[PDB]
Amino acid sequence: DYSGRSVITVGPYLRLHQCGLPKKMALELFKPFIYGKLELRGLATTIKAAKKMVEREEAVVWDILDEVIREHPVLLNRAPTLHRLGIQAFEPVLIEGKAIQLHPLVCAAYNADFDGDQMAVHVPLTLEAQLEARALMMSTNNILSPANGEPIIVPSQDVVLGLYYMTRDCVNAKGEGMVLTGPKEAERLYRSGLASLHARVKVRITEYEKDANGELVAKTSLKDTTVGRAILWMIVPKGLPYSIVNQALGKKAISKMLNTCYRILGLKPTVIFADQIMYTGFAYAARSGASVGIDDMVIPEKKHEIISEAEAEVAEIQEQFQSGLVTAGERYNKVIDIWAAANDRVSKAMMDNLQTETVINRDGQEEKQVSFNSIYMMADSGARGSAAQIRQLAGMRGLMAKPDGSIIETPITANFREGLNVLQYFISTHGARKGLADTALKTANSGYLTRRLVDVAQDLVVTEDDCGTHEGIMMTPVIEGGDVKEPLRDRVLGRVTAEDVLKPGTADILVPRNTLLHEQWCDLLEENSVDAVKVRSVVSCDTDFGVCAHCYGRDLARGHIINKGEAIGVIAAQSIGEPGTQLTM
Amino acid sequence: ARVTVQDAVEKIGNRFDLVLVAARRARQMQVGGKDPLVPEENDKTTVIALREIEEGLINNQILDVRERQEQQEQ
Amino acid sequence: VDIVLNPLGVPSRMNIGQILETHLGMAAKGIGDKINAMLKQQQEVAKLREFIQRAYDLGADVRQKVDLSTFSDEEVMRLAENLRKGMPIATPVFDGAKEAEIKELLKLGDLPTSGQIRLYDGRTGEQFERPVTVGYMYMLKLNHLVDDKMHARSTGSYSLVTQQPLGGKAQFGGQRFGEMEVWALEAYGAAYTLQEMLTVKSDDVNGRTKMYKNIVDGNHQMEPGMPESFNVLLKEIRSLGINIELED
Amino acid sequence: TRYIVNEVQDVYRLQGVKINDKHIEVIVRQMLRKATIVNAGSSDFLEGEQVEYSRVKIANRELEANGKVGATYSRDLLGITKASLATESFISAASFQETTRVLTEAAVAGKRDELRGLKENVIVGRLIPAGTGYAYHQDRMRRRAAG
Amino acid sequence: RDVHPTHYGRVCPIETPEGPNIGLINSLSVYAQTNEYGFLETPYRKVTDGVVTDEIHYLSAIEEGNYVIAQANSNLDEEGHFVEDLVTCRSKGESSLFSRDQVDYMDVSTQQVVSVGASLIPFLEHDDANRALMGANMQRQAVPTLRADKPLVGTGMERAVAVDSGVTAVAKRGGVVQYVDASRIVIKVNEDEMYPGEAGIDIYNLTKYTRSNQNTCINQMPCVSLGEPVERGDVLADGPSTDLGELALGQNMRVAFMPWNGYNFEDSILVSERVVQEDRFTTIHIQELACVSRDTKLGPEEITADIPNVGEAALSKLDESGIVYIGAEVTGGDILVGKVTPKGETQLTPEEKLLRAIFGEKASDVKDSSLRVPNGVSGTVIDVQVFTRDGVEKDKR
Amino acid sequence: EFLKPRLVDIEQVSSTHAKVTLEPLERGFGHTLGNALRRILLSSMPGCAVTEVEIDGVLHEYSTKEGVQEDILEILLNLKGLAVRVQGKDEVILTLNKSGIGPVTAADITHDGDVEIVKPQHVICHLTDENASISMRIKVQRGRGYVPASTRIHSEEDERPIGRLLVDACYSPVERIAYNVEAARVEQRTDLDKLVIEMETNGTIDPEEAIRRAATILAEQLEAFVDLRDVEFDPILLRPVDDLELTVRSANCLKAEAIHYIGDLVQRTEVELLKTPNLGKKSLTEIKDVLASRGLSLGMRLENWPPA
Amino acid sequence: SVTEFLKPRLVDIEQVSSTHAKVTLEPLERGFGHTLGNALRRILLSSMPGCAVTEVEIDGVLHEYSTKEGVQEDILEILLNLKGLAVRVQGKDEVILTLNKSGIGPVTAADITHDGDVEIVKPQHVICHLTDENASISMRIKVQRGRGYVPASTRIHSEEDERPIGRLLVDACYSPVERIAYNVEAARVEQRTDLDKLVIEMETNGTIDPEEAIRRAATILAEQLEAFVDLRDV
RNA sequence: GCCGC
Ligand SMILES: [Mg+2]
Ligand SMILES: [Zn+2]
């Protein structure tokens, strides 16, 4: 009981801890609370009178309902709850309508989008449940993902596009080498149109440093930058360098600056910074007026020449085959290889044409810069799209075939800007159907695996502080042949050392033992040349019926070491099983 | 209104014990026989207890002692 | 404009027909606009017929041949009034209009060839920096509505077996708190929320009424008991040859 | 553990998924219970039994004078499906796979559950011995130990 | 559930359900036909020498595989000869270059591989096949609005779908329109064709608002005015979501492609108030409620306007029989039909006799089992359909 | 120190199209006056719209009329587009009767005292046989914005008979507004701007009057920023306690315990009220017996207790 | 009913320090928050009278890039410091002020010569730091009144570079407004739900008080409409 | 059968 459901829309005016609740759902989810408040205020003497008054929905009932919703958190949940981020707590905001308004920053964690998704609503009618919702399950509490530690609540899509557009440069724009006293003046000139975000100008800038122990030191230095970067600097909290905003902020700088703010400043500042970032990104993305036009998909001029040359190779190799000195396998493999080479060459030509498309004059002569093409900006910012999508849109669709796994000899030489033939579309339908059928079948195989993992791991709780064991596991970077994928810092961060770490200088020890390793310690050991670190693991806890809090490092959801009473088994099962729907089988 | 309880969490650091301590204090202020030790800003007893914890004048030990003193008074 | 659509939905979906349809709709509405303007000023039938003829025989060797010469003078007026809103273009599935044809139709309608125009913010009056694509698109309303998809329950009827609330709207049911939801609550460490979901407010027959009375009294204390589903399970297992009991 | 962590991470890293190695090692630990016995002297002889019970029993036997009583053991490796059906609680592992297979053995052996895990307390309807319910379960344990 | 190369001109490789039934439910291609034995066929144009002929043959999967079939989009001359020597063809489940003489058949049309529903997507070849699947599937969920609006951009298949579906009214033997009305059309058949004796005229009863299987509204409106000549096969009245005989299942919106302050984040759509004011995307929904009276052990169940223990306010909208007046606006739990069932009682207690003495003879012994509007249902009385048993008294309504 | 715009050169293209010029303007003020004027004129202009209809035979909208080519819904949608200009009234009734053949238009609406039909060739209906008539009563009201028929309920305060044909009211006579800023021809001044406003309406509101109304609205709204400055209810309770008709001994006991109102008493529990001297076990049930006939059990909980 | 519009009441002003204010007005009709906020911001950010430093004459090198005779601060930073100096000129269209300083120490605004018709709001404003040597600095700055913001695009005065060297092309900020921003939120009154709540945040150079700036901006905007509100006046 | 994955 005390449950609801409807379609979700977006609320961009919402704070991170807020959600928009239809006022018709409330007055039903909170009926006993309304009865109690009605009887307490003397409006209704009997429960029958309160029930009749609520049934008629008078205005005083709406006033009482607002007070009931004044300070009572609520839970929203999306139907395939792969992880605990599946349900999050919010403070309801009463709205006129029939759809739940959801904050855009939690959509990624919910895996939700506004094309028909619905959520359920639950009310915690208990002092203990209300506190648990406020202290454990609120959105402002769970910002880091408890699977890798990276921020799960991050800007995306229009926020990334707006921030990327704001922090860009143009070689010649309104304002050049202009000197400004304050970033607000740059914003004032920008509002007047005197200052251009693309235009690069010098403004007086100041910074605060946490290097003094628990103290920030002011540092005022005039710096080179653009108008948009100075305008965005007004949002950054104190204690962050100015070098964090003199960049494209391509959706990776934004996550990095959020992570640095969390690690240096705390949670309340990062929660605010994120809200401000989403607001300003939306506003400037709207102001930019970005649009997609048929002319943005630029086909390279040399595409037809490459196609014709490849056709010449196909004809000559077949003639070599007709002469009889080439077997079927040889010619088939060679044709596949040359078609792949031609596809790569045409894709490279397309990307080279589309990257620095803007050849722009300067104060003297002419220069070339990064293009302001809308599709290229979408791909470069990381807001949406990739190279493979753009390559298909403006370059060849490429070699593909999935009737049984083989490859059709002649590829699709047409993009989507040009039309496809009936034959090429029929060929692509095979891969389309294969992917769509794989999606609707692998889901079970993943859910069964998640069930088995949860059922095997549910009985694991941190029940000790420190077991004192000296056992551990050696940790080294993942080097495969000549290529490395995982540095030592990633595999070591947030772990407790089983043994002392010695530098190449003998006897000398950079770090102590049984010590959790954080960003400072990892940076210190990265300056030196340590390659192997012994860290204690849960497989050697030495504690029966549970693990110690020292053999398990810090929990990834909070930078501190994990506390007793945390169900680590369910966390591990959910974090392993949440992907798998995206694993290609 | 407190969006973030960090301060309250750090006052006695477990993220689990504080939820209980605040439930005990909120029961005291809600069922009866208790008045807030901080000004009341038209907010609910839950956040009142959380703010009292953040201000440093409420913890599990004081609840145990105040209870002992009031039991000895009767 | 009537609708505002996100450009970010196009490039990662490879929905290029959206943009081409928008451009061609802009061209069609431009031709209709020209015809409407001509009809407003009551221009003589000859030049209106001439413009309709010029618009109909445009393209690159299209099969459709239509001449207004064999058209009645009144029928020309009726046709012009019928296509006063816009010219209904038709592009067959794999054999249709090309970019150049769309561009020359745009030129005949006296519109920018790129399909992008200058737009102004309605709240501030400022011009947007980049040109924004504006045109006409065919939009549908599907059979999914919030009214047919908004449900909220506080307390209703319950199944005789398991003493648990019914499911689904049109029956005033409650939302199912499944296994993964319970896993998430366990992962959070929210024991009291889980106990209040698992016991009272679900299958505790006495706990439900006690909790309702406490909430009406403004107490907010769970006082949890034992679910009836576990009693049903005990009876079902005892109905086999197996004796199952609760020790003290 | 190194073989399992490296092998499973290869699948995930190839697709671009970041998962901390702690989570994989948590599930390997649950796979490393149920040690066998290759000795005797402590009422264990050639049988599959819990690792924790062996270490607890050995420590008690080694604590006393008869240190040689402690039995040498060989650790096993079970699958996640086979390890979850080998738990000492019959209420769980009957809610996961097939009840008839588990309920039949439990009836013959006459075992007890004692409700020490998360699944068992969820079914009964009690607070979990984790999170905010961890303290409540601890206080009850002292009362049982103290009578 | 995969696409087979023999699916070419028989089943469209786009239209299919998504989740559980993918690849198991298919649709016929627009030209496909079934063999007498029961095997799917598709038409091809014969090719003799280097010139295609307008004669058309239907070939099953084996028949098509045996011959080299050219592509629909291969250029031809005035005499019918291919402009380009080397042409693209399908020989045996594959495709490659062959000489024009090598080809034995030619694809009749490009659409030959597209379903009728997909045939309605303009610029389909610039859309992803899996994505197009979604568009074709979603095209069939659209609900007709208050007024039909033609597509500004189409494909030319709207007329065939509109007419062949039987939704419109088509002149079977059209002559000249004699009388027009919102509910009837009368046509005076031309004298050039007639059935001897009794002469004859054509009467069409246009369908007015009526419930559909999905509770939408099906309505027909005339397209002809008066004294209008009408030929055979012309459209007289169009049904739901049809405009002058063309399929019109949506509306033409003026759209800008830009981000607007986070209100179109993800797939959200920002709509102006002029769309709401102009009643575009407004639909009519029709619901059916029924009440039945059956004899009971207590006795017959009677339908009456008078109801025990009910105030005059609930009986304001009832007829003398006890039914809501046609055109009444009903909300909440208003009473539609007044029905009373008898109760069982044969021991007259003195209090019961007293109750019968002060109050009516029944003393409200008869229970109340009436048809009330379910909560959440606001409707206006549109049509009442009283049916009466043979022998029992006919209802006053 | 600023020049003030003047209303000069107001030219009217068509009956609906018009141009308004504000000749003298400073550097930036062109848009500040413009965009503000466009927003005010598109949002809040008064007008008159058809509110409800009463056709003879038709009682609802989903029916048809014999002899009439269009449905009732189409007739109502046609009437929604009828533009009128009433003077001195807000609830004129536009009677319309016409029997015969051909489209029925506003023209043949009965000539009211002070009601102007801006375009009389606006068709609303069609007749298809000689022996058919249409007769309807149309109510026109004055308003400001879009008021849907479903959203208004105060009209249901008095019961409306079966046969009403209400239609959504828009009340806004402005359809399109565009503005543009040019350079003023004044050569003595260094550089001045001129604002030109094009408004397309339904012929109901004058252009100059519309501009005056918008400017007046803007001035009244700005008047607030010119000088910002600024820097126990239920009737059964709160009733005399001598309304329960209690016994004699209760009167002194209630007076002794300072029980003078009804609400304060119902806040007394049994166990604590028994502690009062000489209350009496049987007399206590008498107190409860009387308060039970009112429906007021002892032990209630009010929040604030006023002196009255 | 008609011709009657909602008026804001119980408006809240939050004054921070002495140059920062936050004004909240509620309730407003739908769309009026954006109209009022945009008009007020535009006039405040573009058309407001005030006095500012526009020309600077330093004894020594008159080039834009100069050795600065070892004054420890680049001439660009000197012009930046004089750009932010705020003055209150009384009854003068223009006035020339000269400041000369000797001996190690920071040059503040109080070191300018005293003129009875010119007021300095921040005497602790720092112009140039000491050369670090017993050197002497002579400065000649003239403050003139104007409107809005006039960037130093070009001088176009006197002949050739005679005025540009004398002016040194200092950016002129006549308007006494540092920042002006507004936000429109959702407010509800009685049964109505779609109303505007306007929040204005403004900071000032210190010559004027935020509320006074709002009053002046609204006053000039209202006086601009007199030619249309005069006859049509209540 | 359909919708959201
Ligand atoms: Mg979705
Ligand atoms: Zn350990």
Numbering used by the authors:
A (entry chain D): 348 to 932
B (entry chain E): 2 to 75
C (entry chain C): 1094 to 1341
D (entry chain D): 1230 to 1376
E (entry chain C): 548 to 944
F (entry chain A): 7 to 237, 248 to 324
G (entry chain B): 4 to 237
Give the article text.
Transcription initiation in bacteria involves the recruitment of RNAP by sigma factors (σ) to promoter regions located upstream from the transcription start site (TSS, position +1). In approximately 60% of bacteria, a major variant σ factor, σ54, forms a class of its own, lacking structural and sequence similarity to σ70. In σ54-mediated transcription initiation, σ54 recruits RNAP to genes responsible for regulating a variety of stress responses, including nutrient depletion, membrane stress, antibiotic exposure, and biofilm formation. In this study, we used single-particle cryo-electron microscopy (cryoEM) to determine the structures of initial transcribing complexes of increasing RNA lengths from 5 nt to 9 nt, which allow us to propose a mechanism of RNAP promoter escape in the σ54 system.
Using a combination of focused classification and electron density subtraction, we obtained several distinct structural states within the same dataset, including pre- and post-translocated RNA states, as well as σ-free states. We focused on the pre- and post-translocated states which were resolved to 2.8 and 3.4 Å resolution respectively based on gold standard Fourier Shell Correlation curves. We could resolve almost the entire RNAP (including one α-CTD), DNA between −29 and +20, 5 nt RNA as well as σ54 CBD, ELH-HTH, and RpoN domains. In the RPitc-5nt structures, we could resolve extra residues in RII, including 93–106 (Inset). In RPitc-5nt, residues 104–112 form the tip of a β-hairpin (Inset), and residues 93–103 emerge from the β subunit side of the RNAP instead (Left). We now refer to this β-hairpin (residues 104–112) as the RII-finger due to its functional similarity with the σ70 finger, also known as R3.2 in σ70. In RPitc-5nt, RII contacts the template strand at the −5 position, and threads around the template DNA–RNA hybrid and forms a sharp kink at P110 (Inset). The RII-finger is stabilized by hydrophobic interactions between P110 and Y112 of RII, and the conserved P251, V253, and P254 on the β′ lid and M330 on β′ switch 2 region (Inset). During initial transcription, as in RPitc-5nt, the template strand expands into the back of the cleft. The template strand now interacts with the σ54 RII-finger.
